[PDB]
Design a protein around this ligand. Sequence first.
Ligand SMILES: N#Cc1ccc(-c2ccc(O[C@H]3O[C@H](CO)[C@@H](O)[C@H](O)[C@@H]3O)c(Cl)c2)cc1
Length: 159
Amino acid sequence: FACKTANGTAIPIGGGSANVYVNLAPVVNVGQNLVVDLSTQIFCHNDYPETITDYVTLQRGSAYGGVLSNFSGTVKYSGSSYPFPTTSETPRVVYNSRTDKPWPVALYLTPVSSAGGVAIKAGSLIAVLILRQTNNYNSDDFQFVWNIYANNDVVVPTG
Ligand SMILES: N#Cc1ccc(-c2ccc(O[C@H]3O[C@H](CO)[C@@H](O)[C@H](O)[C@@H]3O)c(Cl)c2)cc1
């Protein structure tokens, strides 16, 4: 089991870390969601699906910078939504193919009532998402740590 990103980096068997750079909607209003879709950013596969089934959770999701300061919301993982920053580990998604499969994670971030102006700065760390991989074969339990950076400023209008 290993993963790759839309910015051309990787995390091998056994886990590790990578950086992910996301384009964000430049304007988000109070009462609306900024969507951060990681399913177009992070992809993984099973290295021996003939025998082994891989299990993958979102173990932890943490907010940073302008997201921590200026937003609240949820994370959608494989069709169900949970609070973000996270408060527990999600259920598992199965990986059972050598073909790349997206990691089905998206953040839905809504501005806090006091937010206004540049609420997320270009280049800044916005989140750290930990993917936990186990399997039905051995005792492997590996963390794939995804450091999520904004490529651009996000503004919350004062109207
Ligand atoms: N014959 C034969 C043969 C026996 C074992 C393996 C083999 C290949 C990869 C293996 O392990 C890697 O891939 C697994 C599947 O994604 C993951 O569950 C593991 O955590 C690890 O990343 C492990 Cl155990 C075993 C490949 C071929």
